[PDB]
Design a protein around this nucleic acid. Structure first.
Ligand SMILES: [Mg+2]
Ligand SMILES: [Zn+2]
Ligand SMILES: [Zn+2]
Lengths: 1341, 49, 144, 392, 49
DNA sequence: GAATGTGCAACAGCATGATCGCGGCAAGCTGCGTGCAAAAGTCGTGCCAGC
RNA sequence: GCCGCGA
């Protein structure tokens, strides 16, 4: 109960010291959840194809009274499973069927219908499906799609950093960013002027668009400003009192309250005077005339005598204007605030900038602005203003955009119209005014609450919506001329645009790349990858330094360590272990609630915005039995910082120490002891290791190996396993327990392991079973381990005995010295699978035909070809051996006498047919694994193809006979029980078949009911068995509907074993890497007193400068683990009693300092104890978690337990001279990884090959026989050396001298070593290009 | 390159291949190091006609 | 920052490539006064490091007047530098490339001994490319 | 301006051909509209279109937007395709790719001399194929070129012998990818090794900025007599010891070697042997190897120095000096003419570089090359002997 | 008379002329009556403008 | 006391941003039509020369 | 050309 059936095989000694609250999630939930919400049905229109259909459908013709009313949709069953689809090289997808009906309405009767044709579902498009692991098998490829991280649509305020005009004036701007549509920008000029950049056009004042909303200038001033009223009656010219307004001002004259002096002229301005004035209730008071001179009138008062009026808004007043308004009877005059203490002069300045004061004028002005083309006719302007903004279809904010809008402007409601309204622009303009006024602050662009993450499902949704819009565009046109006879197939379905768009997105896109296939770790880290690039993202060059830094909000959401190094540092990230996605699309991380002083187990997921308010505790905070904090003072993070708070002020608690670290960096033990950059290097390099011949568990790990291995889908996990019935190297058959079962037909579980199969990186994928026979297997158990996995535990390297010491300079710099035993034991030996393809297809003169017989080829090359012209399986090919014999017919219809006698002396063809046969490319060798001949339907099947189909049939019937055998056994048991119930003949009844003629009839009830029903069950079971077997038979042998030109395809797979060698690249998982320098014999390597030599020799100098202390700690701890394993092995050698071995195992497991590991052998079976002790005889595979791992004291006491030195260093003797080294050397066991950088793919040499017709220079790179480019810098170095002749030979006679090359070759073959230079063709090409312009360039004499 | 070519075209100037980059582009011996000896002898021939 | 260093190296190489030693000795009397570099109160560069491998444009007079230590137009090396530092000399007049006075190149005397070898630089050495590479080789390690 | 090929006999027209054919189409339609006495408006528009097409062809992206092909990318014109990055970077002006060139991962060889480098014999026999053909034709093994080619492909033993004969003293120049200064490309004498990785002498790595953690380097064959002399006299590693930036020796021992000498030249208050008086440095080595004395023991040794005060001559002086066993052992590799006080220190990466500089300035070039090689040998050997290790 | 034409720019395939009227090395610099193709080393495709 | 040019500052457009390698995809496929003379090529047909 | 990778 405490441990499942996989764990009792081998238990990792956890060091822990901190209990876990929430277990690690599925580790691949983002992709699966995204596609499930994209695919699965929805009763509402939240998301998915249903939501897209709601967005597009229904559609109707323009007043044509014809509409397309659809109901529901359905995805078809794929015709091929993942295995067959991958083998054949086609895309794994499903057909899409949709039900829609014609409704034709009455033209004479309004809102009346005459026809309703409810046609059945129609097919359109083929939607690729995601596998169970998170990959899209398209074109026989894996193609994982990376999640994108971009700017969330909404409102963003920016400060520009305040250095644009060098005057120190900080410019605050606002950006309106939609999910789909045109952007908007509100900018502030240095003269404090509103400007609007719409769709990134030229700068335009905001007053035009403000008036375009049917807003008058007086109304605009009233809305955007606070108005005051000045009363001038009987020449008193009183002023209203607003005490909160006048904060900074100079009293130009005496200010009296109700005839009593309140504030003198130029008196005190302190808050005491303002408070005293406010305390005294005073009505309006008179003011000096000169004060009102600077005021600006807001409204437009009308003269009662004549129609003439002072309508000049945003203007001052004159002394004669006072008399003019007094004559007109203007007792009260409305003037704007005119106050500059916190507010400022805005809006009115822009209105003074532009004189357009009409909606028509604003519309025509913006029409001429965005579009310099034809002027409008009162209709183009209105239509464009409707289409650009506040449009249902042309412009659309997403729901996340609306919620960000509401949050940014402090609005109670969250839901709302997906479009922007009139008050919206007013609100954002007011907020932009306020932020310059002082209230509010600018937000952070790189805040993780302002960055959204879109997954595969959302992108596929957008692509499908685009395709649906494209289809509807012509669906509308088709309905115009459609009669009643038209059905949906003939109603312009247009599946082609939908399929083309979907395939273009899924196959050829920026964020759909080849999945890495080195170890399961690379697949895991690639599937949960976060890319800042993409269609809607930012280009590499558009990124700055701030975008590539670690924002303090990256704590529990984005890994700070794992990221690419050179060009893409900071632009690509990995999700943290516990990080998930919010409903709107923002990253959340879990935390534990804190109530009073006790930390409860309840968990809340907090996003970037939410977690900035609460005070979050630390994972490394000690707790009590009841959960209370041991210390009254605890370190915490409050608002982007780190401080120390009381135990009562803590709001949330970090769930675990791994929360900050992603999957890739979680497998680095003692990560906290390594430098951050070296840790990054190690995390990057862990994903490049290749699986070896035999997986080897890490003697020191972090406990995340099991989760990574199981959650990657690389292994085989028992879905509902019971007890194992049959184990094979390629099949596992499990009989499910009777406690849980599906009623009727019983059933068993069959797993078909994938044998040696080429990966994406040409590595090998293999699966080997872990269960032997009759082993009880629980649900979720591990049956078979994939490449680089041991007993369901991730294992992508090998444990090696390592000594840190300089050895004759053979480990100089980062070089590695490796003993010969490493090569002997086939460690670090890998299998690489390569696929070769040859295709037959028709041409001008006939069919390209594949045969063993090939003209003008000796019998030596035909020894390895069968009677159909293919290699024997398992034949060892090397060099340019012939794989498949393909002959291409040539053309000749004029049999000249020479050709006649040629055909007479030789065969009828007389070798007229040319050969184009697949030969192994040079430098490629190995054994042939499989052949996958594919044939076109109608043509004669290949001879080897018949054997392939026979093998497929035999496998199908063999794997199908088990359930039928079980079912007939059950029926026979039931019949036997029935016959024992009455008229039992004992063994004689079992002697005669067919239940001894159904035991005659016996009783009437048994004959009429029991025997008849049993016979009926037998008959229908046999009929169903025959039907399903025949269906599978017909399915397997079906002619392929292949490509047109292609008639036949054959594919050959080659396997080669790549053994370790000096130049190869090997590295650990702490960022230490190197290239081997020498393979040392056993006798030459250092050995200890016991005489066992070390395996790897490493340079100590790499440690103190790189700060990789995890290297030394891991070596010491692996030495301790291997010492424990050696003790267990020695005790097993003498076959002592199980009790004392159990006691030693118990004592070893309980070692530690308050470790949360409660493994006990008292409840452990004796045979189970024996098996466990036999499993870890190599070494005790302990596990130290990332940020709470083993301490030095624990490691030293573990070393003491295993009878090893406490310091971790032993006396080493030189293997060649036998002399002891003066200082002790730290010998340990370190997990080394063989990276995918091998010299067999990095060794190139060319003397003379192919060139390009342009510039006549040699081609570039390997796989093309290219030469090493001599760039500008090396030529500069040649000039600096003064080596002019070497430079001349490197510029002319080596690259671009068409005759110089041949002359040099002839001279060297002769043995002259003469230059004879010439004129490079590149300069002649340049001259021709320049002359091809209007420029004449020539060579003088 | 656009700016330099226009000014060079209208002026009708000549390069004369006196520096290192010009001789590298053409492919002759650069007037430095071992190629200095060859370039000096050629100059006297041009001077002497 | 590697791109910013490589661009500077490209510009320096381009601007300095057309410079080779074409003359043995121009015979100019111009030069540069050279003193140990001191910022405030501490010594940051002694005279020996700065003046080593350079040709004196003028005789250096010891504190004793009318006393000639090393004549004009001579190459300074380790022995001469040690003899000079033995006395109390502070400033030395040393000819430089900016005052070579020669046309289309630099004199072999105005340019001191090449830093690669102990001997004086010989005619035909492309000094511009060497100088540009020497200046631009760092920068990848400059902390910006 | 070749047009691209692809599946079938179809040929996809290129960018330059697209611009040229657009110009021809516009010109043909405009010239045919001239003879029809068409209204001035259409002829005006067609002339404008022809002018725009010509401007796009000659320099795409000027005076308007840049026209695009099938994809949404600019159709690069004559100006954009002058040579690579609009100048002469790519196919001209030091942009040429060259043959007789190899490339592979570099490892360390501590047995190599300063002028030697390890070359794979599989990389060879390819870079030196014409020379092998010439030697095969010269020695009568193959009369015709076809026979020599076939027997080189078959790779017989005599082919390997002739490759060894050809390689004997033909220098080959190695360079690393980011060639910063002139010392980033250096000539070496190749020695054939049975592998696939280039073995590089450690002392030059500091000049190459090269470390053995995955670095790769390229090989070029100076296949000319003048080129061979230039590689031997101007490019050889033994030739450039002082860097042409400050004059300090760029070839200096580092890493293990510095640890090898530093551990050797150290003193301990008590060790095996105190105050022993020994006649020569040979006896110090004898005692250290026999195990009767320690490297850090303080002893008095009778040591003879050579001095160069005599004009072009060396004088020998013998004296009893108090030193350690390690310094006495190290004294056996230094050349004559250097004072003993050059090794009576700790030798912390600054005294050894100073001693190399003094050896160059006082003796010459061959003695300091041999001295550097011996220093690197003894540093590696005694670093291995010391067994230095880093623990927790 | 197109961008890729054989009457100018030289022949397409070695010393062979279009229509096969004069396709030998014996003929040199001869204009065929049927087509203006002349017999040349077919490298003049790099030189004729 | 009003009038007329020289300096000047903000502004829009152009040019540039390290080197050398390795591995995978996905495309990129481009333009008539016309009716007749004028020519050339072809097919059904009959011919002589060899066995 | 994109994408990923090595120094
Ligand atoms: Mg490196
Ligand atoms: Zn001079
Ligand atoms: Zn012709």
């Amino acid at each position: 109960m405490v441990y499942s059936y996989t764990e009792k095989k081998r238990i990792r000694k956890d060091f822990g010291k901190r209990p876990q609250v929430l277990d690690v999630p599925y580790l691949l939930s983002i992709q699966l959840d995204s596609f499930q919400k994209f695919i699965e049905q929805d009763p509402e229109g939240q998301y998915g194809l249903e939501a897209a259909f709601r967005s597009v459908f229904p559609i109707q013709s323009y007043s044509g009274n014809s509409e397309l009313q659809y109901v529901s949709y359905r995805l078809g069953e794929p015709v091929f499973d993942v295995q067959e689809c991958q083998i054949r090289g086609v895309t794994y997808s499903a057909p899409l069927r949709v039900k829609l009906r014609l409704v034709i309405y009455e033209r004479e009767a309004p809102e009346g219908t005459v026809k309703d044709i409810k046609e059945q579902e129609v097919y359109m498009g083929e939607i690729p499906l995601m596998t169970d692991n998170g990959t899209f098998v398209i074109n026989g490829t894996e193609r994982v799609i990376v999640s994108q991280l971009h700017r969330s649509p909404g409102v963003f305020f920016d400060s520009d950093k305040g250095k644009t005009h060098s005057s120190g004036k900080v410019l605050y701007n606002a950006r309106i960013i939609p999910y789909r549509g045109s952007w908007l920008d509100f900018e502030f000029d240095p003269k404090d002027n509103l400007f609007v950049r719409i769709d990134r056009r030229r700068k335009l004042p905001a007053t035009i668009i403000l008036r375009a909303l049917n807003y008058t200038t007086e109304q605009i001033l009233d809305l955007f400003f606070e108005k005051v009223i000045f009363e001038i009656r009987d020449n008193k010219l009183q002023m209203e009192l607003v005490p909160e307004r006048l904060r900074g001002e100079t009293a130009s004259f005496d200010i009296e309250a109700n005839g009593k002096v309140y504030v003198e002229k130029g008196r005190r301005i302190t808050a005491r005077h303002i408070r005293q004035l406010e305390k005294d209730d005073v009505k309006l008071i008179e003011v000096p005339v000169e004060y009102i001179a600077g005021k600006v009138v807001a409204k437009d008062y009308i003269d009662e005598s004549t129609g003439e009026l002072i309508c000049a808004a945003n203007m001052e007043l004159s002394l004669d204007l006072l008399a003019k308004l007094s004559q007109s009877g203007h007792k009260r005059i409305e003037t704007l605030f005119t106050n500059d203490l916190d507010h400022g002069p805005y809006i009115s300045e822009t209105l003074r900038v532009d004189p357009t004061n009409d909606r028509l004028s604003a519309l025509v002005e913006i029409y001429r602005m965005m579009r310099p083309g034809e002027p409008p006719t009162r209709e183009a302007a209105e239509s464009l203003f409707e289409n650009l903004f506040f449009s249902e279809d042309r412009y659309d904010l997403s729901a996340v955009g609306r919620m960000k809008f509401n949050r940014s402007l402090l609005r109670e409601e969250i839901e709302g119209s997906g479009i922007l309204s009139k008050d919206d622009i007013i609100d954002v303009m007011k907020k932009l005014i306020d932020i310059r006024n002082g209230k509010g602050e600018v937000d952070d662009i790189d805040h993780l609450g302002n960055r959204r993450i879109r997954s595969v499902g959302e992108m596929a949704e957008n692509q499908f919506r685009v395709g649906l819009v494209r289809v509807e565009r012509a669906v509308k046109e088709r309905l115009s001329l459609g009669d009643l006879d038209t059905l949906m197939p003939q109603d312009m379905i247009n599946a082609k645009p939908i399929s083309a768009a979907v395939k273009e997105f899924f196959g050829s896109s920026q964020l759909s790349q080849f999945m890495d296939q080195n170890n399961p770790l690379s697949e895991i880290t690639h599937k949960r990858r976060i890319s800042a690039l993409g269609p809607g993202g930012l280009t590499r060059e558009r990124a700055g330094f701030e975008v590539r830094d670690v924002h303090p909000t990256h704590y529990g959401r984005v890994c700070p360590i794992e990221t690419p190094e050179g060009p893409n540092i900071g632009l690509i990230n990995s999700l943290s272990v516990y990080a998930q996605t919010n409903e709107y699309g923002f990253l959340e991380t879990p935390y534990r609630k804190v109530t009073d002083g006790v930390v409860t187990d309840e968990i809340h997921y907090l996003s970037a915005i939410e977690e900035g308010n609460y005070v979050i505790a630390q994972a490394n905070s000690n707790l009590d039995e009841e959960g209370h904090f041991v210390e009254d003072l605890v370190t915490c993070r409050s608002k982007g910082e780190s401080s120390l708070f009381s135990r009562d002020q803590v709001d949330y608690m970090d769930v675990s120490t791994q929360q900050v670290v992603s999957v890739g960096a979680s497998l680095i033990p003692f990560l906290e002891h390594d430098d951050a950059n070296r840790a990054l290097m190690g995390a990057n390099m862990q994903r490049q290791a290749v699986p070896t011949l035999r997986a080897d568990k890490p003697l020191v790990g972090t406990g995340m190996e099991r989760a990574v291995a199981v959650d990657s889908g690389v292994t085989a996990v028992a879905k509902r396993g019971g007890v194992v019935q049959y184990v094979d190297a390629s099949r596992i058959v499990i009989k499910v327990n009777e406690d849980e079962m599906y009623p009727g037909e019983a059933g068993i579980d069959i797993y078909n392991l994938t044998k040696y199969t080429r990966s994406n990186q040409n590595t090998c994928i293999n699966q080997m079973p872990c269960v032997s026979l009759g082993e009880p297997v629980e649900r979720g158990d591990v049956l078979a381990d994939g490449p680089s996995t041991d007993l369901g535990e991730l294992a992508l390297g090998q444990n090696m005995r390592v000594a840190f010491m300089p050895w004759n300079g053979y480990n100089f710099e980062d070089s590695i010295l490796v003993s010969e035993r490493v090569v002997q034991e086939d460690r670090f030996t890998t299998i690489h699978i390569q696929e070769l393809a040859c295709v037959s297809r028709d041409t001008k003169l006939g069919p390209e035909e594949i045969t063993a017989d090939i003209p003008n080829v000796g019998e030596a090359a035909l020894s390895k070809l069968d009677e159909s012209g293919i290699v024997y399986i398992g034949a060892e090919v090397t060099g340019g051996d012939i794989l498949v014999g393909k002959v291409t017919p040539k053309g000749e219809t004029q049999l000249t006498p020479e050709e006649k006698l040629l055909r007479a002396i030789f065969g009828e063809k007389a070798s007229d047919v040319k050969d184009s046969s697949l030969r192994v490319p040079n430098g490629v060798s190995g054994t042939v694994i499989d052949v996958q001949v594919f044939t076109r339907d109608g043509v004669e099947k290949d001879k080897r193809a018949l054997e392939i189909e026979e093998m497929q049939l035999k496998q199908a019937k063999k794997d199908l006979s088990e359930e039928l055998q079980i079912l007939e056994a059950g029926l026979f048991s039931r019949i036997r029980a029935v016959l024992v119930a009455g008229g039992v003949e004992a063994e004689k009844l079992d002697k005669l078949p067919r239940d001894r003629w159904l035991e005659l009839g016996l009783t009437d009830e048994e004959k009429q009911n029991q025997l008849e029903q049993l016979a009926e069950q037998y008959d229908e079971l046999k009929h169903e068995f025959e039907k399903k077997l025949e269906a599978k038979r017909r399915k397997i042998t079906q002619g392929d509907d292949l490509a047109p030109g292609v008639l036949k395809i054959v594919k050959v797979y080659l396997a080669v074993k790549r053994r370790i060698q000096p130049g190869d690249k090997m590295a650990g998982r702490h960022g230490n890497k190197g290239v081997i320098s020498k393979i040392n014999p056993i006798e030459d390597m250092p050995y200890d007193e016991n005489g066992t030599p070390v395996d790897i020799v490493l340079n100590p100098l790499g440690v103190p400068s790189r700060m990789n202390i995890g290297q030394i700690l891991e070596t010491h701890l692996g030495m301790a683990a291997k010492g424990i394993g050696d003790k267990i092995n020695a005790m097993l050698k003498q076959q002592q009693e199980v009790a004392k071995l159990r006691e030693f195992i118990q004592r070893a497991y309980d070692l530690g300092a308050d470790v949360r590991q409660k493994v006990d052998l008292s409840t452990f079976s004796d045979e189970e104890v024996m098996r466990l002790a036999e499993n870890l005889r190599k070494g005790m595979p302990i596990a130290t978690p990332v940020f709470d791992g083993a301490k030095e004291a624990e490691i030293k006491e573990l070393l003491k337990l295993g009878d090893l030195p406490t310091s971790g260093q032993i006396r080493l003797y030189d293997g060649r001279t036998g002399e002891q080294f003066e200082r002790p050397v730290t010998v340990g066991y370190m997990y080394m990884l063989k990276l995918n950088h091998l010299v067999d793919d990095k060794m190139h040499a060319r003397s003379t090959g192919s060139y390009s017709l342009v510039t006549q220079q040699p081609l570039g790179g390997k796989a093309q026989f290219g030469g090493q480019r001599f760039g500008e810098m090396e030529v500069w170095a040649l000039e600096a050396y003064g080596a002019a002749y070497t430079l001349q030979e490197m510029l002319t006679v080596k690259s671009d001298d068409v005759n110089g090359r041949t002359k040099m070759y002839k001279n060297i073959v002769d043995g002259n070593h003469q230059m004879e230079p010439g004129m490079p063709e590149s300069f002649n090409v340049l001259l021709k290009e320049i002359r091809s312009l209007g420029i004449n360039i020539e060579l003088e004499d | 390159t656009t700016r330099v070519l226009t000014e060079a075209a209208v002026a009708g100037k000549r390069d004369e291949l006196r520096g290192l980059k010009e001789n590298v582009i053409v492919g002759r011996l650069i007037p430095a190091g071992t190629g200095y000896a060859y370039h000096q002898d050629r100059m006297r021939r041009r001077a002497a006609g | 920052k590697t791109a910013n260093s490589g661009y500077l190296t490209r510009r320096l190489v381009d601007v300095a490539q057309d410079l080779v030693v074409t003359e043995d000795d121009c015979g100019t009397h111009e030069g540069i006064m050279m003193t140990p570099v001191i910022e405030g109160g501490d010594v940051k560069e002694p005279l020996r490091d700065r003046v080593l491998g350079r040709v004196t444009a003028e005789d250096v007079l010891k504190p004793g007047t009318a006393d000639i230590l090393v004549p004009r137009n001579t190459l300074l090396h380790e022995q001469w530098c040690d003899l000079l530092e033995e006395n109390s000399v502070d400033a030395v007049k040393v000819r430089s490339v900016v005052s070579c006075d020669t046309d289309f190149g630099v004199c072999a005397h105005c340019y001191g001994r090449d830093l690669a070898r102990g001997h004086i630089i010989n005619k035909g050495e492309a000094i511009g490319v060497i100088a540009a590479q020497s200046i631009g080789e760092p920068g990848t390690q400059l902390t910006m | 301006r070749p047009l691209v090929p692809l599946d079938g006999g179809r040929f996809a027209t290129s960018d330059l051909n697209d611009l040229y054919r657009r110009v021809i189409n516009r010109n043909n339609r405009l010239k045919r509209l001239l003879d029809l006495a068409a209204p001035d408006i259409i002829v005006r528009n067609e002339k404008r279109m022809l002018q725009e097409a010509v401007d796009a062809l000659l320099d795409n992206g000027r005076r308007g937007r840049a026209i695009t092909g099938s994809n949404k990318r600019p159709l690069k014109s004559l100006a954009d395709m002058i040579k690579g990055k609009q100048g002469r970077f790519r196919q001209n002006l030091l942009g040429k790719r060259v043959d007789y060139s190899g490339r592979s991962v570099i490892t360390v060889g501590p047995y190599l001399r300063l002028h030697q480098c390890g070359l794979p014999k599989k990389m060879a026999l390819e870079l030196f194929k014409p020379f092998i053909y010439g030697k095969l034709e010269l020695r009568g093994l193959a009369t015709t070129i076809k026979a020599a080619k076939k027997m080189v492909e078959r790779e017989e033993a005599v082919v390997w012998d002739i490759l060894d004969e050809v390689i004997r003293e033909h220098p080959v120049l190695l360079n690393r990818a980011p060639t910063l200064h002139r010392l980033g490309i250096q000539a070496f004498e190749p020695v054939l090794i049975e592998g696939k990785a280039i073995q590089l002498h450690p002392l030059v790595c500091a000049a190459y900025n090269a470390d053995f953690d995955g670095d790769q380097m390229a090989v070029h064959v100076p296949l000319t007599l003048e080129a061979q002399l230039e590689a031997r006299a101007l490019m050889m590693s033994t030739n450039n010891i002082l860097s042409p930036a400050n004059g300090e020796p760029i070839i200096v021992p580092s890493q293990d070697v510095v640890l090898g000498l530093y551990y050797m030249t150290r003193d301990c208050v008590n060790a095996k042997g105190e105050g022993m008086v020994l006649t020569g440095p040979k006896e110090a080595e004898r005692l250290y190897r026999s195990g009767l004395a320690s490297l850090h023991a303080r002893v008095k040794v009778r040591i003879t120095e050579y001095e160069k005060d005599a004009n072009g001559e060396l004088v020998a002086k013998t004296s009893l000096k108090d030193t350690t066993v390690g310094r006495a052992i190290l004294w056996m590799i230094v050349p004559k003419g250097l004072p003993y006080s050059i090794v009576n220190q700790a030798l912390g990466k600054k005294a050894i570089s100073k001693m190399l500089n003094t050896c160059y300035r006082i003796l010459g070039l061959k003695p300091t090359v041999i001295f550097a090689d011996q220093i690197m040998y003894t540093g590696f050997a005694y670093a291995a002997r010391s067994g230095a290790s880093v623990g927790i | 008379d197109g961008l890729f034409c054989a009457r100018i720019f030289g022949p397409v395939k070695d010393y062979e002329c279009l229509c096969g009227k004069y396709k030998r090395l014996k003929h040199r610099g001869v204009i065929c009556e049927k087509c203006g193709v002349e017999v040349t080393q077919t490298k003049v495709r790099r030189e004729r403008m």
